[PDB]
From a paper:
Cyanobacteria express instead the inducible NDH-1MS (NDH-13) and constitutive NDH-1MS’ (NDH-14) photosynthetic complex I isoforms that convert CO2 into HCO3− by kinetically shifting the reaction equilibrium towards bicarbonate, against high cytoplasmic HCO3− concentrations. The 0.5 MDa complex has an overall U-shape with 19 isolated subunits. The core structure is highly conserved across the complex I superfamily, but in contrast to the respiratory enzyme, the photosynthetic complex lacks the N-module that accepts electrons from nicotinamide adenine dinucleotide (NADH).
The catalytic site responsible for the CO2 chemistry in the 50 kDa CupA protein electrostatically binds NdhF3. CupA has a fold, comprising α-helices, which drastically differs from known carbonic anhydrases (CAs) in which the catalytic zinc (Zn2+) ion binds to histidine (αCA family) or histidine/cysteine residues (βCA family) at the interface of β-sheets. CupA is capped by the 16 kDa α-helical CupS subunit that binds two helical lobes of the former, and could help in stabilising the CupA-NdhF3 interaction. The active site of CupA shows a strong electron density that we assign to a Zn2+ ion, as also supported by inductively-coupled plasma optical emission spectrometry (ICP-OES), which indicates a protein-to-zinc ratio of ~0.7 in the NDH-1MS sample. The Zn2+ ion is coordinated by His130, a putative water/hydroxide ligand or carbonate, and Arg135. The Zn2+-site is located at the interface of two 12 Å helices, and CupA forms further contacts with NdhF3 and several lipid molecules. The putative CO2 binding pocket is completed by residues from NdhF3: the Zn2+-H2O/OH− is stabilised by Arg37 that forms an ion-pair with Glu114 and Tyr41 of NdhF3. A non-polar tunnel starting from NdhF3 that leads to the Zn2+-site via this Arg37/Glu114/Tyr41 network could function as a CO2 conduction channel from the luminal side across the membrane. Remarkably, NdhF3 binds a chlorophyll a/β-carotene motif that connects via His469 of NdhF3 in a TM-helix to the CupA site.
Residue numbers in the entry:
A (entry chain H): 2 to 79
B (entry chain C): 13 to 126
C (entry chain B): 13 to 449, 457 to 494
D (entry chain E): 1 to 100
E (entry chain G): 1 to 168
F (entry chain I): 2 to 49
G (entry chain A): 5 to 201, 207 to 370
Write the structure that this text describes.
């Protein structure tokens, strides 16, 4: 029922469920006593395949699609 | 013999207050869905699976902050009857309590300097 | 009320703070001095109140008679001798020196307070002040596993001994109505009962832990190997001083001398100490462990001073307890000086030291022979007075055992002088074959060695002192 | 509720603390047993103060001091245990024997 | 023969049973954290026993220090030293276990005989209710040396413990 | 050397107190304005 | 009036063993204080949700009751009916006990909340000191909620919670110390009856220290570290589902009404409509046995206590949305580096002013 502390660098998973507005990013980060040794960001939880779609849609068919890459401002990418 | 006046209420109220959680948590147990056993029973790791190993990388970060707390927790116990009885004492007790507090201040400075 | 008897302790107390704040600001400091100066001032503060005033009490909670001054000066001198040895020792280790001298001076303050304390609460507080600082000093070199295991062992034994002593103190407070005072308990209970015997044995269990009386001895051989060697030097002189002071002030003055079953108990413990601590010391390979068992044996010797208490056994005990300071400070200074240079090792590595370093040999052999009881030397007269104070009372068996154990001790004390002198250039140990070729260490070594060789024949000036101190023990 | 009952209870707590201090193998449990022992002592002191010396209570101040110093000795003992653990990497009290 | 004394007896025996069971759990249980919490249970029961003995200040002080400071320290340290407990059984165990058991039972019987035999001086005068002002008077009149030396005790304990548990 | 550190500490503490008092006043002022909430089920927002 | 006198007398009129009547009365105040504590919890939840909405140009709950009055009732009844979960390898008995050890001593500290004289459960001799001692059991509850979890996420939250609740216990005691210096004692009624014509005007530093320490009891968004959602998900609470989580949700607002009432009684006083009311001899009222004047002054005292408790509840749930959070290390520097020195300084200052000017102290 416990976690068995041991003198190593600890790896914590700030996984895909970010209770914030910073999308879905995994960020497996290790730390040695309130530091950061190195983090491995695990992106890709929102790869829907826009590049392969764009090859099969005409321009006016694709222009509604573009407002998604970088949501916000959905007019730069337009 | 017992001459502590006010006690009668601390025992009865201790009972009636300890009865609040063990009654609400039993009323909730009577009327609530049954089991949810299979995979409801895992540990929340932001949706992913626990990485394995699962240690903490022990730190003295929270032993020293409890050592220094024990020290001054004892200090307050030593200082309470001095403050409550500061009327009958007068001077020459302020001097001794002041020596006590100065020693504890040097202790705090030592803990704060490292 | 009458805080004058405290201007000896508060001085040292001030040093504890001043040799601490300077370590907060500087961290590379010369606190070894103004700590020697602090103890020197604390000792010089005793001359005004050694003979000038009569015996005084703080509030009944502390007494400053001549016996108290004797033991306070004894513990202060032990701390002064330990500060000298521990300068280049804990500095050679990657550790601080101010945070060590504060602990050492606090242990000294506790030992000095427990000497003149005559109340249950204050006795407990002084004893625990000594014990906590003893644990902290034992586990100081936190890099070595032996030091940590020794500190853990010593703490687990000493805390249990203190719990037993506290149970005895609570029983003693409950038997005699209230009266946390010591002299007000003798007036209350003046008859042997089961409660009084149980309180007596439970106090003895916590006294013998301090003075190393067997079967309450089994920690010194494991603590002397573990602790830093200057901590061991302070622990074999100052801790026994405090323990014997507390035993005299407690047993004689609190436990109504009508219940002198403690004389039987201490006869048992002294016989057992003499027999064990000298027989087992005979088969040892390290110098610190040998000195541990030797220290047990010497405590057994001292315990025939106040087991026949006759105003001459007390004086014999005090004189041997004073000479033991010069013997053991000088026997530990040479051990430190050898383990510093190259050795860092045991008895077998002493072989051939007469060629490379003759001063260390001439200083260590003198102290080992003094411990053995060799004529003119501080130890011979100490032991002769211990043995005659034992015959003059009627304890034939105790003295006839002390003599045989003195021979057993001469054997393994001269076995070290064997290695130090005998060897030719082909029989030097590997630690002497490459022996190299720190001023306070030498100036403490020379002083303790010239004291252990002259305080034997120039003993008359420090027999009147012992007698005026003994005049205060009740009987 | 008599003095003899409180004293027998304190003696029995002393007994249990001794058993735990000698038998237990983990290293923090011996410290907890020492705390049990000191509580068995404080109970004696408070019982004596309540029954024998009830006006100028002197066992209660002595008990305050005992509690203070039990806290201090615990603060030092856990430090000693952390130091020995940092090097031996265990708390098995049957592995701190550097002797024969 | 009263309703007050009946409550003071029932509560005393309830707290005594709690003390015995929790103190046996501290030393017998195989898991160490259960012992760490039953220790706070012991301390709370003894704090109640103090209140039942007209000592209201020292009970609150015990709750502050033992089940509020020493217990939290013990819980932290028990967490710091978790390594899944691979204790291999040692042969010379039944010897020391049996010795501890017999010496404990013998010492307890001896103490019980001593307690039931000696004639304590009960001094039937009701105690004082204002038990904290008296403790305040004794810190600076009678117990001035211990009150003053406890400060240096705490300082040396802090110094030494920071030195031992430091990280370098 | 040591007085400049203390005067900087004071100039930081009093600044942190004023910059909390200002925010407290701003928030206590905010609760006088009419809520901009468009209480949907009974105050539906007419589209463009 | 002395309702206790009438109750015990009318109960002894029909026999029933007069000494037993005094035992048959304890449940009456022992549950009146429970009632007022539960109503205070409902009020605190409602005030938080409706004041955070006003601060942000918003509207709180309005479709539950008339004004969202039934919002705390719904939020509690939901958590009652929720399925409780106990994860795979978590302990089974320290799990369901953490949320109860963090709650029982928060309720028990209501013995000393006066609400006017003779209107409190058994004014105790230890009073505020008993509360200082009882407020040290919750860290055991947080360590228990963290140790009994297979989630290393939540053990790290239990540790940083138990390490914050002990950081703000020394200054919280050094402020009550300076108050008890002036108060001549520790009982709350005896602490407040020194206001006979307020301690905030003579302890202007101890008030600040006490209030900051009480707000830093893992309570408010100034700190609320184990509840700081963004940095870590709920800390130790991240695994409690039904009533076990409602015990945390509840033991954190009762621990706020309690602190508001305590600041009121220590530094302001649950009595004393500001003028020295009991010097209303100008209406020639024989207070002593006036059958009413008694009830009128009772109502005045209750209202004057609740005004100054609501003042601080309001100010706390206003600072929640005004002060930015501190990481954990800027937090542990408030205690032990700013609040502990200033607490000691305030204690020494009160001592010096009490020794020099024994009048007004
Ligand atoms: C969720 C939160 C809210 C929920 C409500 C709580 C649930 C209870 C609902 C029932 C409400 C009906 C009760 C009517 C209130 C009048 C009763 C009263 O005042 O009774 C008062 C008496 C007084 O007691 C006596 O009071 C005497 C004198 O008053 C003293 O009171 C203080 C002590 O000194 C003052 O300092 C004062 O100067 C002093 O003289 C003596 O002290 C006696 O020793 C003492 O026994 O106590 C008593 O029985 C009172 C005991 C019952 C407590 C209930 C009080 C509820 C608060 C209602 C306040 C109404 C405000 C105005 C209402 C109209 C709107 C404008
Ligand atoms: C056979 C089966 C039996 C099973 C038993 C179970 C069944 C239960 C029975 C019925 C349930 C009734 C429950 C409540 C009834 C009310 C009882 C009461 O009135 O009890 C009266 C009690 C008792 O105290 C009173 O106390 C005084 C008497 O002195 C004595 O009273 C106390 C007890 O001794 C103290 O010790 C005091 O020092 C002592 O001297 C008074 O004059 C009365 O006599 C006395 O009764 O009142 C107090 O305790 C003060 C606490 C109340 C104060 C109210 C302040 C109210 C708060 C405001 C409300 C709004 C809050 C909402 C906002 C909140 C936001 C923070
Ligand atoms: C004047 C009052 C008189 C009575 C008052 C009682 C109030 C509380 C109890 C309500 C009556 C039913 C209780 C039975 C317990 C239980 O849950 O059984 C299990 C069944 C579940 O159904 C069952 O579900 C079961 C599976 S499961 O476990 O629920 O998933 C399944 O086995 C079963 O066949 C299926 O039917 O559930 C019920 O019977 C009721 C549970 C929920 C009822 C909530 C009522 C809310 C009342 C609170 C608000 C009132 C305000 C204050 C009033 C004082
Ligand atoms: C922090 C966690 C807890 C730590 C400590 C827990 C330990 C509990 C504390 C122990 C409390 C001590 C013992 C209580 C003493 C009971 C007897 C007593 O107190 O005497 C009083 C009277 O005692 C009683 O009458 C109380 C007995 C009843 C208490 C029983 C508990 C009540 C249970 C709930 C009520 C149920 C009622 C319905 C039952 C049918 C004295 O009266 P007084 O204060 O007025 O002083 C003067 C006196 O009136 C005359 O001179």
């Amino acid at each position: 029922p416990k976690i068995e502390t041991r003198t190593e660098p600890m790896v914590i998973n700030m996984g895909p469920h970010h209770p914030s507005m910073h999308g879905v990013l995994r960020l497996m980060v290790t730390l040695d006593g309130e530091d950061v040794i190195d983090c491995e960001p695990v992106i890709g939880y929102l790869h829907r395949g826009m590049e392969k779609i764009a090859e099969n849609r005409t321009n006016i068919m694709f222009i509604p699609y573009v407002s998604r890459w970088d949501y916000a401002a959905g007019m730069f990418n337009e | 013999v017992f001459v502590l006046s006010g006690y009668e209420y601390f025992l009865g109220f201790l009972i009636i207050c300890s009865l609040v959680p063990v009654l609400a948590l039993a009323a909730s147990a009577l009327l609530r869905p049954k089991s949810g056993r299979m995979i409801r029973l895992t540990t929340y790791e932001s949706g992913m699976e626990p990485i394995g190993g699962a240690w903490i990388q022990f730190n003295v970060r929270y032993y020293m902050f409890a050592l220094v707390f024990v020290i001054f927790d004892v200090e307050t116990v030593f200082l309470y009857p001095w403050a409550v009885a500061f009327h009958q004492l007068g001077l020459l007790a302020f001097i001794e309590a002041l020596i006590f507090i100065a020693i504890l201040v040097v202790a705090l400075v030592y803990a704060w300097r490292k | 009320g009458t805080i004058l008897p405290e201007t000896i302790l508060i001085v040292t107390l001030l040093v504890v703070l001043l040799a601490d704040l300077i370590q907060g600001r500087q961290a590379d400091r010369w606190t070894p001095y103004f700590a020697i100066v602090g103890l020197g001032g604390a000792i010089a503060t005793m001359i005004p109140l050694w003979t000038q005033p009569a015996t005084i009490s703080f509030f009944g909670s502390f007494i400053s008679d001549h016996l108290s001054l004797f033991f306070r000066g004894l513990i202060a001198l032990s701390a002064l001798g330990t500060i000298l040895m521990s300068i280049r020792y804990v500095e050679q280790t990657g550790s601080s020196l101010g945070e060590f001298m504060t602990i050492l001076l606090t242990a000294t303050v506790g030992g000095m307070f427990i000497a003149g304390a005559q109340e249950l609460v204050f006795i407990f507080v002084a004893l625990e002040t000594l014990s906590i600082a003893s644990y902290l000093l034992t586990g100081y070199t936190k890099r070595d596993s032996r030091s940590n295991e020794a500190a853990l062992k010593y703490l687990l034994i000493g805390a249990a001994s203190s719990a037993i002593f506290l149970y005895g103190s609570s029983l003693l407070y409950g038997l005699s109505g209230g009266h946390t005072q010591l002299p007000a308990i003798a007036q209350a209970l003046s008859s042997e009962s089961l409660g009084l015997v149980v309180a007596l044995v439970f106090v003895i269990a916590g006294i013998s832990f301090k003075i190393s009386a067997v079967p309450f001895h089994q920690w010194t051989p494991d603590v002397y190997e573990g602790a830093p060697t200057p901590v061991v030097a302070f622990l074999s002189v100052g801790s026994k001083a405090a323990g014997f002071a507390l035993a005299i002030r407690f047993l004689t003055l609190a436990f109504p001398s009508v219940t002198d079953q403690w004389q039987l108990i201490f006869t048992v413990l002294a016989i057992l100490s003499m027999i064990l601590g000298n027989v087992v010391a005979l088969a040892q390979t390290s110098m610190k462990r040998m000195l541990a068992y030797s220290s047990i044996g010497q405590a057994g010797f001292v315990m025939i001073g106040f087991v026949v208490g006759t105003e001459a056994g007390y004086a014999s005990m005090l004189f041997y307890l004073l000479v033991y300071l010069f013997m053991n400070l000088g026997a530990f200074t040479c051990v430190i000086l050898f383990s510093l240079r190259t050795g860092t090792d045991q008895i077998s590595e002493y072989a051939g030291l007469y060629q490379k370093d003759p001063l260390l040999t001439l200083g260590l052999s003198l102290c080992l022979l003094s411990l053995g009881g060799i004529p003119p030397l501080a130890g011979f007269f100490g032991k002769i007075y211990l043995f005659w104070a034992g015959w003059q009372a009627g304890a034939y068996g105790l003295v006839l055992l002390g003599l045989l154990t003195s021979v057993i001790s001469i054997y393994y004390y001269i076995r070290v002088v064997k290695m130090m002198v005998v060897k030719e250039p082909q029989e030097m140990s590997e630690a002497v074959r490459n022996y190299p070729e720190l001023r306070p260490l030498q100036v403490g070594l020379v002083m303790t060695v010239i004291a252990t060789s002259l305080a034997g024949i120039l003993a008359n000036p420090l027999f009147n002192l012992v007698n005026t101190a003994v005049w205060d023990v009740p009987q | 509720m008599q003095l003899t009952y409180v004293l027998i209870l304190a003696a029995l707590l002393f007994c249990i603390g001794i058993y735990g201090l000698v038998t237990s193998r983990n290293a923090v449990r011996v410290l907890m047993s020492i705390e049990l022992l000191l509580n068995a002592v404080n109970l004696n002191l408070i019982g004596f103060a309540n029954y024998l010396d009830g006006q100028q209570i002197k066992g209660q101040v002595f008990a305050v001091f005992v509690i203070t110093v039990a806290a201090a000795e615990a603060a030092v003992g856990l430090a000693i245990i952390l130091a020995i653990y940092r090097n031996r990497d265990t708390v098995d009290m049957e592995k701190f024997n550097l002797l024969k | 023969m009263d309703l007050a004394t009946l409550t003071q007896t029932i509560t005393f025996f309830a707290l005594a049973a709690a003390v015995i069971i929790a103190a046996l759990g501290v030393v017998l249980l195989d898991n160490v954290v259960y012992s760490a919490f039953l220790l706070g249970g012991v301390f709370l029961s003894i704090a109640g026993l103090y209140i039942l003995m007209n000592a209201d200040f020292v009970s609150a002080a015990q709750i502050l220090i033992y089940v509020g400071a020493v217990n939290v320290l013990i819980l932290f340290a028990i967490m710091l030293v978790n390594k899944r407990e691979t204790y291999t059984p040692v042969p010379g165990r039944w010897l020391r276990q049996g010795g501890a058991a017999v010496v404990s039972l013998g010492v307890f019987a001896l103490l019980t005989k001593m307690i039931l035999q000696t004639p304590w001086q009960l001094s039937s005068v009701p105690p004082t209710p204002d038990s904290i002002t008296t403790i305040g008077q004794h810190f600076f009149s009678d117990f001035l040396l211990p009150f003053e030396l406890a400060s240096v005790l705490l300082l040396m304990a802090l110094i030494g413990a920071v030195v031992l548990a430091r990280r370098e | 050397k040591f007085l400049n550190q203390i005067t900087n500490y004071a100039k930081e503490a009093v600044q942190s107190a004023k910059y909390i008092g200002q925010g407290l006043s701003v928030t206590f002022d905010h609760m006088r304005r009419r809520p901009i909430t468009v209480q949907y089920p009974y105050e539906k927002l007419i589209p463009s | 009036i002395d309702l206790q006198g009438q109750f015990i007398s009318a109960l002894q009129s029909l026999g029933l063993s007069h000494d037993l009547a005094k035992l048959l009365w304890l449940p009456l105040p022992m549950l009146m204080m429970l009632i007022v504590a539960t109503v205070g919890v409902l009020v605190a939840v409602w005030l938080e949700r409706k004041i955070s909405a006003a601060v942000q140009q918003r509207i709180g709950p309005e479709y539950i009751g008339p004004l969202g009055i039934l919002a705390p009732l719904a939020d509690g009844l939901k958590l009652i009916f929720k399925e409780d979960v106990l994860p795979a390898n978590s302990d089974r008995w320290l799990f369901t006990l953490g949320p109860a050890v963090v709650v029982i001593p928060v309720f028990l500290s209501y013995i000393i909340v006066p609400f006017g004289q003779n209107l409190l459960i058994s004014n105790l001799a230890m009073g505020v000191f008993l509360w200082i001692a009882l407020s040290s059991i919750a860290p055991i509850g947080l360590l228990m909620a963290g140790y009994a979890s297979n989630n290393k996420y939540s053990l790290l939250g239990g540790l940083r919670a138990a390490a914050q609740s002990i950081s703000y216990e020394i200054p919280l005691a050094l402020a009550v110390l300076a108050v008890a210096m002036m108060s001549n004692g520790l009982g709350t009624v005896e602490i407040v009856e020194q206001q006979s014509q307020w301690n905030v005007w003579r302890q202007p530093i101890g008030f600040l220290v006490f209030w900051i320490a009480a707000l830093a009891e893992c309570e408010r968004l100034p700190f609320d570290l184990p509840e700081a959602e963004e940095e870590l998900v709920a800390g130790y609470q991240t695994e409690y589902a039904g009533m076990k989580f409602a015990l945390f949700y509840l033991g954190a607002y009762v621990n706020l009404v309690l602190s508001a009432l305590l600041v009121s009684v220590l530094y302001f006083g649950g009595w004393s409509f500001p003028i020295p009311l009991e010097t209303i001899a100008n209406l020639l009222g024989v207070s002593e046995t006036n059958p009413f004047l008694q009830i009128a002054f009772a109502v005045l005292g209750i209202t004057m206590t609740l005004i100054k408790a609501y003042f601080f509840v309001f100010l706390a749930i206003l600072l929640r949305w005004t002060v930015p959070r501190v990481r954990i290390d800027q937090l542990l520097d408030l205690g032990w580096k700013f609040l502990l020195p200033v607490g000691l300084v305030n204690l020494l200052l009160t001592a010096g002013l009490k020794l020099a000017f024994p009048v007004a102290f």
